[PDB]
Design an enzyme around this catalytic site. Sequence first.
Site, PDB file in Angstrom:
ATOM      1  N   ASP A  16      -9.176  -1.503 -15.497  1.00 55.95           N
ATOM      2  CA  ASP A  16      -9.281  -2.760 -14.761  1.00 55.95           C
ATOM      3  C   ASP A  16     -10.281  -2.822 -13.600  1.00 55.95           C
ATOM      4  O   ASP A  16     -10.230  -3.748 -12.782  1.00 55.95           O
ATOM      5  CB  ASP A  16      -7.889  -3.233 -14.310  1.00 55.95           C
TER       6      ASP A  16
ATOM      7  N   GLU B   9      -3.501   4.002 -15.232  1.00 58.20           N
ATOM      8  CA  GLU B   9      -4.548   4.879 -14.711  1.00 58.20           C
ATOM      9  C   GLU B   9      -5.036   5.758 -15.858  1.00 58.20           C
ATOM     10  O   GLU B   9      -4.305   5.971 -16.829  1.00 58.20           O
ATOM     11  CB  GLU B   9      -3.994   5.765 -13.592  1.00 58.20           C
TER      12      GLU B   9
HETATM   13  C1  LIG Z   1      -5.505  -7.510  -8.909  1.00 52.23           C
HETATM   14  C2  LIG Z   1      -5.315  -7.498  -7.377  1.00 52.23           C
HETATM   15  C3  LIG Z   1      -4.919  -6.369  -6.742  1.00 52.23           C
HETATM   16  N1  LIG Z   1      -4.739  -6.345  -5.362  1.00 52.23           N
HETATM   17  C4  LIG Z   1      -4.301  -5.135  -4.660  1.00 52.23           C
HETATM   18  C5  LIG Z   1      -2.774  -5.103  -4.816  1.00 52.23           C
HETATM   19  C6  LIG Z   1      -2.521  -3.636  -4.726  1.00 52.23           C
HETATM   20  O1  LIG Z   1      -2.374  -3.236  -3.353  1.00 52.23           O
HETATM   21  P1  LIG Z   1      -1.382  -2.052  -2.881  1.00 52.23           P
HETATM   22  O2  LIG Z   1      -1.705  -0.780  -3.797  1.00 52.23           O
HETATM   23  O3  LIG Z   1      -1.798  -1.690  -1.516  1.00 52.23           O
HETATM   24  O4  LIG Z   1      -0.087  -2.561  -3.312  1.00 52.23           O
HETATM   25  C7  LIG Z   1      -3.742  -2.996  -5.343  1.00 52.23           C
HETATM   26  C8  LIG Z   1      -3.495  -2.659  -6.803  1.00 52.23           C
HETATM   27  O5  LIG Z   1      -4.693  -2.129  -7.310  1.00 52.23           O
HETATM   28  P2  LIG Z   1      -4.756  -1.097  -8.510  1.00 52.23           P
HETATM   29  O6  LIG Z   1      -3.884  -1.581  -9.604  1.00 52.23           O
HETATM   30  O7  LIG Z   1      -6.181  -0.817  -8.743  1.00 52.23           O
HETATM   31  O8  LIG Z   1      -4.091   0.200  -7.883  1.00 52.23           O
HETATM   32  O9  LIG Z   1      -4.805  -3.944  -5.255  1.00 52.23           O
HETATM   33  C9  LIG Z   1      -4.963  -7.466  -4.583  1.00 52.23           C
HETATM   34  O10 LIG Z   1      -4.820  -7.485  -3.367  1.00 52.23           O
HETATM   35  N2  LIG Z   1      -5.361  -8.599  -5.239  1.00 52.23           N
HETATM   36  C10 LIG Z   1      -5.556  -8.711  -6.599  1.00 52.23           C
HETATM   37  O11 LIG Z   1      -5.909  -9.791  -7.039  1.00 52.23           O
HETATM   38 CA   LIG Z   2      -4.334  -0.114 -12.528  1.00 48.01          CA
END
Ligand SMILES: Cc1cn([C@H]2C[C@H](OP(=O)(O)O)[C@@H](COP(=O)(O)O)O2)c(=O)[nH]c1=O
Ligand SMILES: [Ca+2]
Length: 130
Positions: free
Chosen positions: A16, A38
Amino acid sequence: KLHKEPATLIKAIDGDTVKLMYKGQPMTFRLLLVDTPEFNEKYGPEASAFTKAMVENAKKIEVEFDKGQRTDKYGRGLAYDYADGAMVNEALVRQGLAAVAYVYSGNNTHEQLLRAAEAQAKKEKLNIWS
Ligand SMILES: Cc1cn([C@H]2C[C@H](OP(=O)(O)O)[C@@H](COP(=O)(O)O)O2)c(=O)[nH]c1=O
Ligand SMILES: [Ca+2]
């Protein structure tokens, strides 16, 4: 409505996330409304390979920001990615390589489209739903 903007692929990261050259500067883009496992997790390499093939073999790369926040707490651009007209976000969910997740009201334009793709992936017991 939203609008598609051109961009060029620098390199695919994982299921993603993809590094794109956006308006002259490199930026890591996180796919809206989805969550792929992951690379170290089950279906992670498959998810990575899928996104990688879509964006590398694509002649036309486009990004489509939603109506809200454009970057996250990690400095990543938040948008829907299209490879030769096909949405990467939707394709991953339809194959069961990504779950509909991180659905925020401010950026939820294609929510229904993706939940419909997920329900079909579930019915077919594909990958993460197997
Ligand atoms: C898809 C998306 C993820 N995120 C943040 C939420 C998650 O934060 P926290 O980890 O701090 O909860 C993180 C998930 O990313 P990944 O799935 O790459 O780990 O990216 C956003 O803020 N906005 C979005 O639109
Ligand atoms: Ca992910």
